[PDB]
Symmetry: C3
Subunit: 90 residues, 3 copies
C-alpha cells in the first residue's frame, strides 16, 4: 500500500520531522543535522498532517492522525507525546 | 477512505487551523488558545493542502482544494475567503 | 480520482510553492509575487509532502516524494534539486 507523508521543520539549524502513514500506523523519522533516526512518535492513523511552532528555542509539534472519520491530535511540548483537545464531527 | 487533513499554525499562542477533506467536503477547525471552534471555511474538495504566513501580526492563509485535476486556491487575507489566481494544467 | 497537493511559503511577499502529484508524476507551480509559473521540480511520486526554512534570505526546501512504500527526499539549497539523505524502512 502507498504511504502518505507529512513534514515539518524548525530553526536556522534546522530540525526536520517526517511522518509516514502506512498500514494504519504513523511513524516518525527525524533529522537534527547529524543523520536520520527513528523518532518516539508511533500512533495509529491512515492519514497524517503536522504543524509546529517555536516559543523561543522550545519546539511544539501537533500531529493530526485520522482513521475513518476520527482525527486524533498528538502534542509534543518538550516532554513526550500526549493526546490533545482537538475534536471534529466528521 | 479516511478523512484527509492539512494543518497550519502561526504566532506563539499559537493559532492553529486544521482543514479536513471528508468525502469531497472541506471544513475548518480553529484554535486561538482557548478551545476549538468551527471556522468559516467550507468548500468542496477531495484533497486539501495549506500554507500560511504573517505580515506583521496579519495572517494570510492559502488553502489548495483539489477535485479531479482542478486545484482551486482559496485565500484568507483578513476579510473573507476569496478564489486566488493559482492555476495548473493537471 | 483527484490530484494530491502540498504547499509551502516563505517571507512576506510571499513566495509560494505548490507541488501536485498526478498519475505518478509530481510537478511544481511557483509564485514570487508576480504571477504563477512552472517550477524546475519534476520527480516521480504518487504522494507528496514539503517543508522549507530560511537561512537569512536563502530558502531551503525539502520535498518528500513517495511511490508505493518508498519515500525519496529532494533538496533545494540554491543550486537545483538534489537527492537527499532521507531513508525509511516502510
Ligand atoms: O509496493 S508496491 O507498490 O509495489 C505494492 C503494491 C501492491 C501490493 O499488494 C504490494 C506492493 C505488496 C504488499 C505490500 C504491503 S506494504 O509493504 O506493507 O505496503 C502490504 C500488503 C501487500 O500485499 C498487504 C496490504 C495491506 C493493505 S493495508 O490495509 O492498507 O495495510 C492494503 C493492501 C495490501 O495488499 C491493498 C493494496 C493497496 C495499494 S495502494 O497503492 O495503497 O492503492 C496497492 C496494492 C495493494 O495490494 C498493490
Ligand atoms: O542512516 S545512516 O546510515 O546514514 C546512519 C548511520 C549511522 C547513524 O548513527 C545514524 C544513521 C543515526 C542513527 C539512526 C538510528 S535509527 O533510529 O535506527 O535509524 C539509531 C541510532 C543512530 O545513531 C542509534 C544507534 C543504535 C545502535 S543499536 O544500539 O545497535 O540499536 C547502534 C548504533 C547507533 O548509532 C551504532 C551505529 C551502527 C550503524 S550500522 O548501520 O549498524 O552499521 C551505523 C551507524 C551507527 O552510529 C552510523
Ligand atoms: O475501508 S476499507 O479500508 O475497507 C476500504 C478501502 C478502499 C476502498 O476503495 C473501500 C474501502 C470502498 C470505499 C469506501 C468509501 S467510504 O465508505 O466512504 O470510506 C469510499 C470509497 C470506496 O471505494 C470511494 C472513495 C472515496 C475517496 S475520498 O473521496 O477521498 O474520500 C477516496 C477513495 C475512494 O475509493 C480512494 C481510496 C482511499 C483509501 S485510503 O485508505 O483513504 O488512502 C483506500 C481505498 C481507496 O479506494 C481502498
Ligand atoms: O484517487 S482518489 O483518492 O482521489 C480517489 C477518489 C475517489 C474514488 O472513487 C477513487 C479514488 C477510486 C477510483 C479510481 C479511479 S482511477 O484512478 O482512474 O483508477 C477511477 C474511478 C474511481 O472510483 C472511477 C471514477 C472516475 C471519474 S471521472 O473519470 O473523473 O469521471 C469520477 C468518479 C469515479 O468514481 C467519481 C468520483 C469523483 C471524485 S472527485 O471529488 O470529483 O475528484 C472523487 C471520487 C469519485 O469516485 C472518490
Ligand atoms: O534574481 S532576482 O534578484 O531578480 C530575484 C529576486 C527575488 C525573487 O523572488 C526572484 C528573483 C525569483 C526567483 C527565481 C528563482 S530561480 O528560478 O531559481 O531563478 C528562485 C527563487 C525566486 O524567488 C526562489 C528563491 C531562492 C532563493 S535562493 O535560492 O536561496 O537564492 C532565495 C529566495 C527565493 O525566493 C528569497 C529571496 C531573497 C531575496 S534577497 O534580496 O536575497 O533578500 C530577494 C528575493 C527572494 O525571493 C526576491
Ligand atoms: O537522472 S537519472 O535519474 O537517470 C540519474 C541516474 C544516475 C545518476 O548518476 C544521475 C541521474 C546523476 C546524479 C544526480 C544527483 S542529484 O543531483 O543529487 O540528483 C546525484 C548523483 C548523481 O550521480 C550522485 C549520486 C548519489 C547517490 S545517492 O547516494 O543515492 O544519493 C548515488 C549515486 C550517485 O552517483 C550512484 C547512483 C545510484 C543510482 S540508483 O538509482 O540509486 O540505483 C543511480 C545512478 C547512480 O549514479 C545513475
Amino acid at each position: 500500500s502507498s504511504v502518505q507523508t507529512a513534514a515539518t521543520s524548525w530553526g536556522t539549524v534546522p530540525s526536520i520531522r517526517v511522518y509516514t502513514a502506512n498500514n494504519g500506523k504513523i511513524t516518525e523519522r527525524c533529522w537534527d543535522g547529524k543523520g536520520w533516526y527513528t523518532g518516539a512518535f508511533n500512533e495509529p492513523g491512515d492519514n497524517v498532517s503536522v504543524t509546529s511552532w517555536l516559543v523561543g528555542s522550545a519546539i511544539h509539534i501537533r500531529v493530526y492522525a485520522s482513521t475513518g472519520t476520527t482525527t486524533t491530535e498528538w502534542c509534543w511540548d518538550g516532554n513526550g507525546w500526549t493526546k490533545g483537545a482537538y475534536t471534529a464531527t466528521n
